[PDB]
Symmetry: D2
Subunit: 423 residues, 4 copies
């Protein structure tokens, strides 16, 4: 009976040092029933998961920046960062399948993040294909990507579906938050509304079930928005009543005492279900992170923690230049093994085009010459995109075109280009 | 007869200073027969063509940069550039509906170009919604976009469809080139192939017909890659026979004598069927542009020209600081009223992120600080995206939410945000 | 300061027979503040809106079927139906931008509906382009489409965005229903959850404010699932308190007294905020729809109703042939001016393909030739797709190529075709 | 090296009974150089191509229908067809990412075809998912898909790129035709233009290289339109000169003597670089088919052929009902192991909706109840889609939902649904 052999193999897989901490309130029987008859392979997802787990257990910490194009993810890997962050904020702003500029209010189409992850993996694969074609070895391009699944884009089935989509697109890891989908909001926005703790756990179980049904040890990050969230949908859950002042808004939200206490309560509740815990934060406060991490290690020794080094903070207002300089080392040492500047891509794209565009209006081609000279200078450090035809794969596609002809083509592109003759 | 007015009203619109020197080898009765029973209204396109036309005549010249995201487009407009360039090179590298990193060899889906125009206009539309709600109006958001139609992605029927798609999306001008569509290549790549003059003209006719059928006076830009391309597909056209050496390649291609000679032949053929002539060039050489300008102006005095200040040139290697600085004034004088840096969008993005990522790898939040610190300094020039919640409409959608609510609303986004607290 | 002229124009358009007894809890100045500098024209939306309203005021009733491709819509208009239904259920199952087969649980991307409207309006537009070129005009092609906006896919902001999307696509009417977005099911599935009355009203205001913002009088259709829904998110609304039992579920949902009385409570609550009321129903019961009409008209005389002649009912099981044959004429007398078979596309498509497939396995082209004959015979009833090159516009694009070629062209498609030879 | 060992794995995988008599004008080392550093698994494409090969070699022949929705493909598999045809034509008319209705004139976005293969595999994945959850085995859902790549949509790299696209979407075979890509049109349209035989060969080689790089034995079908095509781009190939009259068109096309001898010249040139050969024909003439099967097998013994049972033929005009009944049986014994009704999807869809729309326009719900009854009748033969909630996976998701809850759930959809009361 290969039914009983398959369920056997599911079970053995579940019972390894990965998953040591974690609870699955479903049998292997259940996963078997719901995964169909043919097990599809998700190479980039599996590789990304295994590589992210190992980095997280073998590095001081993993520091990322959000990317909203493949070209950005590419230059992040070229610089030597070992993981890539997929910001829903950045997706709303400038990269969704509605083609709109959106504030972080869950207004964009739900397949936007997965498609971007798929685009980022595609850029990374072309980089690798190009490097491989030149017999280079100096970069491992399949950087784990950690993706924003917001509040699930609805109910647990919506969670289940987006988890599967992120895996198909090949994400190493996926974060889910405890906000009301109908009213999801940026973590550094007012008006945040919590769901019942049991609600947030159902969401996390749907993540893991999805991941199991795809047969990938995708990393589940449980985020909580409870440190600032002074609104709750329902007082039904015994764990949430203690935080309810017993008053109610004209929409019938329950008012709650937000602060590290409600953040810790949610963190503790979610941690048997999550590979990593994320506590949204009003400011960069190394002390608040020490107390949050202390609280969580108190009952969950060595549980991975992630920290948002948000551009949503005015860093040099909240902190002296020495503390900033040490911030990621300090967060490192408390257990925050994954740290990510969420809106790095937006700020990098918007500021960089503003400075070029404004100098261009003023000084025309002087502005562009200066950028091209900055790009040449940066070649000493790894940068190469100044040679933009090679950068995007004109080299690679020329070699394809030559294998297809047999050496006899008058239409080789990189040969006789301004790139080969002026750089 | 209501039909007779419609056929009269088309004709009247053709017989205006807008179409002063340009030939339509088809009749008002034709446009009528092909345009359906209902006149659909393309506001963004009409506005853009009318303003692109008025600007190219009023202003000394109009310099633009390539946008590949809505955000790049909008920061170009905020920095006071009066028009946006849509590079297909850029669509191919990092912004196409296949989600692939591609060289400039028409590998991406043909609807990628227009989807991006819509996306950009969606962003300028949200910027305009924002400024309007705030009673500001110190900026004109609806900058006209000039878009890459490459070589029409195939036959004249393809040219027809991609022009309509671009007008639907709100392009002000579209540019077609005279490369073989199966073998289309960056203009600065080797191994480019010409179609005959009559085929190149069929494409520009199909493009005006598209525009006449939609009822919009869209600027038509005709590009010649003949300045460098030494391959041609047919010896069929009288005007081209003079350039064929007599050699033929193993593929079939007729070899031709490239040079300013061929470009002038092509430009002069195209000039009566286009609004603006763009001679692709292999170095940023002003005498070459002067020679070309006077050649067209000899026959077509006051005909509009376009110069691609290509990042595919190495400006300091090829020019002294004085020329670079004066380059665009020079071109404007010669009659080049639209000057564009095609790959600006690409190099801003890649350079900016390689530089943030690299500094961030060594120095953690100290690097991100310097970007935030620079973003604040940039406000002296009119940069605002440092306050990123407001930049992308958080404030606009609050107003909408409060109007929907009466005013009784607890889930407002911007009030209570770290953005109001710390900025 | 032409502000005051523009605000006056907004106000006047609101005091017309259209929008008689239609409540807007907002001012013309609010609309002015949100709509932006510039007023983009939505020709199909305007036409469709204006036409659908006239049709509901001059016809015994409009009876329509569900469409999930252009071709389907196209043949519905060819058959003489005057309007088109866009089913979210059908989007779910076989026409969504995730390209997944889903049950009706809002598991698909929220832009799938508006995309499908654009595609239909495209097919219809080409049908029109063809007929116009051939000089025919026995069909008016611009049958208004009524589109499913489910429960807004989230909050009032989610509603406002999806309305505007539908208006860009060219919908005449959009329905919203009073289920929770995260728990949205098919109205004939079990375990539906209502939101509070004040919540549904906010969604219907967001809808209108979207329409006002876009200068288009789009039909708004408030749906209620309160006839069958035994759950509710919150007892906050004074108006809902009567229906609550006081039991709450293990998830916190308040049990309520599902039935025509709740359906009626919601209908009367929504009626002043929508042009059309639709009471979902669990069997085709004329007496039921009589009660419901009497109740609404009791307090809102004239109010247009809409009825789902759902395929989710077994029509033979529930009704004799006499009533089935009378059903739509009876509803029309009651004020159900828009009646629609939601899953007509689904059953037509799956049945037809299964039957062809089943026969083709056993009998090969013997089976296909029966269909091919069935199709010729259908020419008695007005079918023409049997000649499938002319059906999709081979002739029309041939007319375009000729105009382009100046009559020339040795590549015409329909000259030489097996269609001219064999049909 | 591990390099030499990977190069070998490639070399060994070619040196097998598949690839039989198949020339690659490149080395395993070439595939290694271009394939990047990781090799991604492609389960559906590998299963599809292994199964297709196996069917084509063990069944008397495979007969398949066109499909333009997953639902159409679903039902094709359920009625018991062993394979699915993806038709570029159908994609043009009612299934393209332009959302346009198009004639078969290569006017749609190239990734349309691959996007539709994804959707269909998804549909079959959810059917399989359902049948597993109900513990059924009677149907094998993973029916191989044969998809249209037209003329590669451009140069050989466009062929490279769409072949990959088709593989990562899970296509089992892809077909390529020797018409000029910019003038590409229906096999049964006039005005077809041939590319040189050397160029047809590059496109096939491009196809094999893509499949080899993704490491999947995708079935390549070479198609020729040289039976009817009387135009050619270049008289350059020495195999093509014989058929040149020496006349030229104004466009510069070479007139050629079209017919079975030209199609046999193309078939014999292409045979060594394809697994299966396809001669496009103007009528369902069994003699023509024997003369082709013969010409080809004379030099390429046991070469698989494909036949288009085209709906572009008026079947009962050209043949007696005796010959029609026996048509696929005969073609089979001649060696035509793949036989497909290209446009079955279009005809099934347009017929069934026109018929219902017309009946519904006259007799209202009497018309719909006749279809539903016709649907119930069909259950005798395996149809089940009349219970439409179970068909699209409401049951499957109810089980997912119940495993996430652990049995404490009041929002189960089939529980209390009209489907479970009336069916
Ligand atoms: Mn987020
Ligand atoms: Mn280009
Ligand atoms: Mn629905
Ligand atoms: Mn085809």
């Amino acid at each position: 009976m290969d039914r009983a052999a398959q369920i056997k193999q599911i079970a053995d897989s579940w019972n390894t040092p990965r998953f040591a901490g974690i609870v699955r309130p479903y049998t292997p029987e259940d996963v078997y029933r719901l995964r169909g008859s043919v097990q599809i392979e998700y190479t980039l997802a599996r590789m990304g998961a295994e590589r992210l787990w190992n980095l997280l257990h073998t590095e001081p910490y993993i520091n990322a920046l959000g990317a909203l194009t493949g070209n950005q993810a590419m230059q992040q890997v070229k610089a030597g960062l070992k993981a890539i962050y997929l910001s829903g904020w950045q997706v709303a702003a400038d990269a969704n399948l509605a083609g709109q500029m959106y504030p972080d209010q869950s207004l964009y189409p739900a397949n936007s993040g997965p498609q971007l992850v798929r685009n980022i993996n595609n850029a990374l694969r072309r980089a690798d294909q190009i490097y491989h074609s030149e017999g280079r070895n100096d970069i491992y391009w399949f950087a784990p990507i950690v993706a924003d699944a917001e509040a699930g884009f609805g109910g647990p089935l919506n969670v289940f579906e987006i988890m599967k989509a992120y895996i198909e697109a090949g994400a190493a890891g996926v974060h889910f938050e405890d906000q009301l989908a109908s009213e999801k909001k940026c973590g550094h926005m007012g008006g945040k509304v919590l769901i019942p703790t049991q609600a947030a756990i159902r969401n996390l179980v749907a993540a893991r079930l999805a991941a199991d049904v795809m047969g990938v040890p995708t990393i589940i990050v449980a985020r909580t928005d409870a440190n600032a969230a002074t609104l709750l949908t329902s007082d039904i859950d015994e764990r949430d009543r203690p935080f309810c002042t017993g008053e109610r808004t004209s929409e019938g939200f329950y008012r709650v005492r937000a602060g590290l206490d409600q953040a810790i309560a949610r963190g503790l509740a979610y941690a048997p279900y999550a590979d990593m815990i994320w506590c949204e934060t009003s400011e960069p406060n190394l002390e608040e992170a020490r107390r949050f991490a202390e609280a969580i290690h108190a009952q969950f020794p060595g549980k991975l923690l992630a920290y948002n080094c948000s551009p949503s903070f005015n860093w040099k207002k909240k902190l002296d230049d020495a503390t900033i300089a040490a911030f990621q080392r300090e967060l490192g040492a408390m257990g925050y093994k994954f740290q990510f500047v969420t809106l790095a891509g937006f700020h990098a794209l918007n500021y960089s085009m503003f400075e070029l565009a404004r100098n261009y209006r003023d000084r025309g081609m002087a502005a562009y010459s200066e950028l091209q000279q900055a790009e040449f200078a940066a070649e000493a450090y790894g940068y190469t995109a100044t040679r933009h035809q090679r950068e995007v794969g004109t080299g690679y596609f020329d070699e394809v075109a030559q294998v297809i002809a047999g050496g006899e083509i008058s239409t080789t592109a990189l040969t006789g280009s301004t790139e080969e003759e002026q750089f």
